């Protein structure tokens, strides 16, 4: 099942669930630009090796596009072309200047040097130079890639645009040292926990004493753990790796669960903490459920056991369309997984204006601008939701599809 097809499949859903021409719709089904160059880059033995890279513009209607950039060795067209076209709903929603964008190259980084790194970087940069641009393409790091290459990066097109303009713009997730900004680790949690907050409020429900679980220890799933404690007072009693997962009906502290868990290799045998496994989180009754790992986590077997009343989808699509009508049957409310995640592309966009205007914010200022725009987008996919009585994910997608078409209709590439 290719991914691309899968993206397509999902937007004639969403269209036949809302008013759209059928030239739109074509237009909307194609990416307007695809770019596939080759990286040469010099090994540390001395040889030349070429690799293949992306970058996918799917659609510039309502601004330059956005995206990140994968180093990965599964990477295919598909998948960076899904991934664009994913990633102009996720940025239409939040009610963003942008399009969407997607890049990637077919490499494995862990056989990569740090000099063969930063190698590929600037290369990668010196053959997509011509269709990026700070208004015109913004990369964002991704999957298996960090700010100090986002760094890099930006170092390359400043040098081959001879600052001649916010050359610091032109790519974001870079160090603080060099156009950074504030809020950009703790994004992707701090969207989550304003969504959960937003609907738990839209539900009639107090989050102070309520539990929480969640799935993945990583980067986005110990933030939105941290910031709910904190944020929201519920009381975290599970938390689970790859390896396996815990529970205590007490509340677990996630700092010294991060510690053991970067000290033992995995979340498990903490103490007063029952061992058990992902499906028996998954099941377990709690308030507040976040999925923050693999995706396709909650599928049609496992779907009715759910007794979360509020599931925030952090990872990306962790819920199949028939446990997903499972969960709507069940008077389960989801938060669209492109909309709970969007804050690592809203403190993005931020972090772009600040570098364009070369005027930086504090972390107060981003937190409650991120507030503000998770506050609006969630409160717009819900109104939708009730009005056109149909799945809070088909509502997020009539939401980003009719921006997008709406910018498309304004612009006249649409007569309809």
């Given at each position: 099942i290719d991914p691309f097809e899968m993206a397509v499949k999902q937007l004639e859903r969403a269209a036949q669930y809302m008013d759209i021409s059928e030239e739109a719709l074509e237009w909307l089904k194609k990416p307007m630009r695809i770019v596939e160059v080759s990286?040469?880059?010099?090994?540390?033995d001395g040889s030349v090796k070429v690799f293949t890279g992306f970058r996918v513009q799917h659609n510039w209607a309502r601004g330059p596009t956005k995206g990140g950039i994968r180093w990965h060795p599964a990477e295919?067209?598909?998948?960076?072309?899904?991934?664009?076209?994913?990633?102009?709903?996720?940025?239409?929603?939040?009610?963003?200047?942008?399009?969407?964008?997607?890049?990637?190259?077919?490499?494995n980084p862990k056989e990569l040097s740090e000099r063969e790194q930063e190698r590929l970087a600037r290369a990668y940069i010196r053959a997509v130079y011509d269709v990026i641009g700070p208004w015109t393409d913004i990369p964002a790091p991704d999957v298996y890639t960090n700010p100090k290459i986002m760094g890099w990066m930006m170092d390359e097109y400043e040098t081959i645009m001879r600052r001649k303009g916010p050359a610091f713009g032109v790519i974001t997730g870079k160090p603080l040292s060099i156009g950074g900004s504030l809020g950009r680790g703790t994004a992707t949690a701090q969207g989550a926990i304003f969504t959960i907050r937003e609907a738990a409020k839209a539900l009639g429900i107090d989050l102070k004493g309520k539990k929480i679980a969640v799935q993945g220890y990583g980067n986005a799933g110990y933030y939105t753990a941290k910031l709910a404690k904190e944020q929201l007072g519920m009381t975290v009693v599970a938390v689970s790796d790859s390896r396996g997962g815990i529970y205590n009906p007490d509340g677990l502290?996630?700092?010294?669960?991060?510690?053991?868990?970067?000290?033992?290799?995995?979340?498990?045998?903490?103490?007063?903490?029952?061992?058990?496994?992902?499906?028996?989180?998954?099941?377990?009754?709690?308030?507040?459920?976040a999925p923050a790992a693999i995706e396709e986590v909650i599928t049609e077997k496992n779907a009715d056991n759910i007794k979360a009343k509020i599931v925030a989808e952090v990872a990306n699509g962790p819920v199949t369309p028939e446990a997903d009508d499972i969960l709507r049957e069940k008077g389960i409310l989801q938060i669209p997984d492109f909309l709970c995640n969007a804050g690592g592309v809203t403190?993005?966009?931020?972090?772009?204006?600040?570098?364009?205007?070369?005027?930086?914010?504090?972390?107060?200022?981003?937190?409650?601008?991120?507030?503000?725009?998770?506050?609006?987008?969630?409160?717009?996919?819900?109104?939708?939701?009730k009005d056109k009585?149909?799945?809070?994910?088909?509502?997020?997608?009539?939401?980003?599809?009719?921006?997008?078409?709406?910018?498309?209709?304004?612009?006249?590439?649409?007569?309809?």
């Open positions: 990286v040469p880059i010099e090994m540390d295919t067209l598909s998948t960076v072309k899904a991934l664009a076209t994913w990633m102009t709903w996720k940025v239409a929603v939040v009610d963003l200047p942008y399009g969407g964008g997607k890049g990637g190259i077919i490499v502290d996630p700092d010294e669960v991060l510690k053991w868990k970067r000290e033992h290799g995995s979340v498990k045998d903490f103490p007063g903490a029952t061992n058990i496994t992902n499906e028996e989180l998954l099941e377990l009754e709690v308030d507040v459920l403190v993005s966009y931020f972090e772009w204006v600040q570098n364009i205007n070369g005027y930086y914010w504090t972390e107060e200022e981003v937190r409650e601008k991120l507030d503000k725009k998770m506050t609006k987008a969630f409160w717009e996919v819900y109104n939708t939701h009585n149909i799945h809070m994910r088909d509502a997020a997608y009539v939401v980003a599809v009719s921006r997008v078409y709406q910018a498309m209709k304004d612009r006249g590439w649409v007569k309809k």
